[PDB]
Point group: D2
Chain length 251, copies 4
């Protein structure tokens, strides 16, 4: 309770699934939140469902849109005051092996999953350093930042990139006393409406050969580790990977 007292958080892709759960728990712990998403209909409903405009608002944004990042920080500071906390959560998938990835598919996925995270991390350091905010950048990765999947080649590339790029940012911020931490969160399989819309997906993901716990996670599993990383409880954690995966990567 009040674990994020005074924090101001941007959560990209915060209108659905993991991002929406992070936003919900952030508001419940006293943070002011700006969620982003592609679609006004979904985004405005999502913000209203979590709380009042004094607590949480929506900003329509594609994380691949570099100029839009400036507008997003400006809109969040106008609404809530200086941003302390960024969750780079917006991401897309391509179900292709490296062999069967088109260059179009490659560039489209990296635009969101890599460029978008770079744009958010770079602007976050610039805008949140040296302000005594206890600033925290949480770069959403996944188990595919650690292990290959033969049918997620570009996705693997993006998650490995974010994993190590985040360590570079963590070290530079630490060495320069910027009061900015950077960490990655690595969900395993998480049940969402999108997973429910794919027949057989949850059962395949719940197989003991994939998830040892024999079931998949829920969005709040990722929200709770994000509360810890956004909070001043984690003031000595930077450049670290936090895995919440039901044992996927342990075997």
């Amino acid at each position: 309770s009040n674990r994020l007292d005074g924090k101001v958080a941007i959560i990209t892709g915060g209108t659905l699934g993991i991002g929406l759960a992070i936003a919900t728990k952030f508001v419940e712990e006293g943070a002011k939140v700006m969620i982003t998403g592609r679609h006004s209909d979904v985004g405005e409903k999502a913000a209203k469902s979590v709380g009042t405009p004094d607590q949480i608002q929506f900003f329509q944004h594609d994380s691949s849109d570099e100029d839009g990042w400036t507008k997003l920080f400006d809109a969040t500071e106008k609404a809530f005051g200086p941003v302390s906390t960024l969750v780079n959560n917006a991401g897309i998938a391509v179900n292709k092996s490296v062999e069967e990835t088109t260059t179009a598919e490659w560039r489209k996925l990296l635009a969101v999953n890599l460029d978008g995270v770079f744009f958010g991390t770079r602007l976050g350091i610039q805008r949140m350093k040296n302000k005594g905010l206890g600033a925290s950048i949480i770069n959403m990765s996944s188990i595919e930042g650690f292990v290959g999947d033969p049918s997620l080649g570009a996705y693997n590339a993006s998650k490995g990139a974010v994993r190590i790029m985040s360590k570079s940012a963590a070290l530079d911020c630490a060495l320069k006393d910027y009061d900015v931490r950077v960490n990655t969160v690595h969900p395993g399989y998480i049940k969402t409406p999108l997973v429910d819309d794919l027949p057989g997906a949850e059962e395949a993901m719940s197989d003991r050969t994939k998830t040892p716990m024999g079931h998949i996670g829920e969005p709040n599993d990722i929200a709770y580790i994000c509360v810890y990383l956004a909070s001043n409880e984690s003031k000595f954690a930077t450049g670290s990977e936090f895995v919440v995966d039901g044992g996927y990567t342990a075997q």
Copy 2:
């Protein structure tokens, strides 16, 4: 607040430093706690300093003492009811390279840092499985579970052993639906009275070439990640390593 509602925790080496901070925050989040330590004088004072006997008690124990583990679980269940949570934190150091480690030094350190953690983990699974406790075993490791230190050879052996042994235990508990999670916590350098007693230690540990943040941590840095791992907030985390190290292993 009340993040450990109804939990019953054993914390080995809970009378000093990191263990004492874990015990303090566990009680503050509603857990009943049994702390262990070698010395009655230090242990009874430590327990009283955190709370009343209804909240926290001391049990004199060497974690290398196999039979004493049975007495410890029995004393904790008698005091507080069935144990839900074990923090294997008790550990010792030898300041020797592998080359310069005596066999006596090797066996003494592994007795506490490896055998003790095995004894606690094995008994914990046996006593806490299949009871709907949301049981959690937190095996304290360190950055020396990831990276070598040329002057901590036996210590490195013990921390690597606990790191991978914990994944074995996590997987077996998950695959068998034991309702027991096993994770490791990897502190970097943490300021304690013991570190304060070693002239020059903190400044050497705070060098940017060791800890990028340019200072060392405090015991509460490790207490807060332990609250998360003991709590049902981390119900999808098992077989994972949680690093809190000021950037030590990121470079």
Copy 3:
């Protein structure tokens, strides 16, 4: 001697430093080699310096040039017969933190270090699978695929991407019995004419806090592990990282 009997190798950035040493040892072990580089003057001299056109030729190419990859495979097959072996070695550096990386710098580095490796890996799988060649793709990474450097943000992103993308490719090739292995090689600091051209670089790289061996490597250090990975000696190695770094990542 004759460890690469009958192999046909493409080595990108094979006209200088590590790439040139890989080409030299590949020819010395009986492989036919096509080296690539940006500049005809350097490339033709480099090829002639290693051997005769029956052994090694130069092909002018920017690894970021997607269409040029088709011309490169075609030129190599025309010269030497079907390609068995690809070393994605071509790479560039930007000396910027994430904070201080321009979008132009970001895209230029990823074009070579990530897109180029994707283009080479994808085409390599397509052209070398199911031909009984004992095909091997060696994706050059570095220690910056494992650990951050605060002043190599985009470089870190590229090396992490290649590290995990290579595991995806390895798994897909293995599961489909393509007779194609994919592995990454991670040099630490290596002495080259380019390093010699930067005053103070070698001494800074040789500091015990960077390279425990107290000196940097030489190009043949990377050539020898590449001979092993190109050879049928490594027929059970796929999806693996091979580090040759003087202890950099061990501490």
Copy 4:
């Protein structure tokens, strides 16, 4: 050919499987070899099968026997001159979860798999440093040094211990210019007479969910990476893990 010119190698557990293949290829590359094993009948036959006493001899030894290590180094130096190369390969298995490991089973396995490797590594550094031998200690681990197996708890503990202890030894040797490298080798599943003696073992180990290549390795797969690590080709590799596992740990 002659890749181990002038090298003198001790290979523990060198009378069977992986150890015997390492010994065979070491002799074929010009090394003088002392193989160890528990049983004179198997050991003398094994040595004779590889070569003449001028090339390879047997020394009866339990790697858990500390005093016997002194006799082994002395017997090898008497036969072949100063030892340059140690392969700590001797190891045993217990098929138990952590939960179901007896203390007797725990101590018996750690005596060979951990104490034995410590005893060999410590004595190796002492006896091989500062002699211009290009000395190399190769500590045999396995995939169980990286990932848990729910039914190999003590085995996991031993392999994690050796993995990180080896990095400590590597760093100390590097920082002190001892001319001793220490690395670990991590086989996946390897076909041996012992595996052939267990009905169904190879097919279970060859399942795509275990080994992506859909078959297990052969002893020469581990011999070839050991030749590289014993040779001066790997003079810049220390403190590194070398995985040869058919993709096991890549997924």
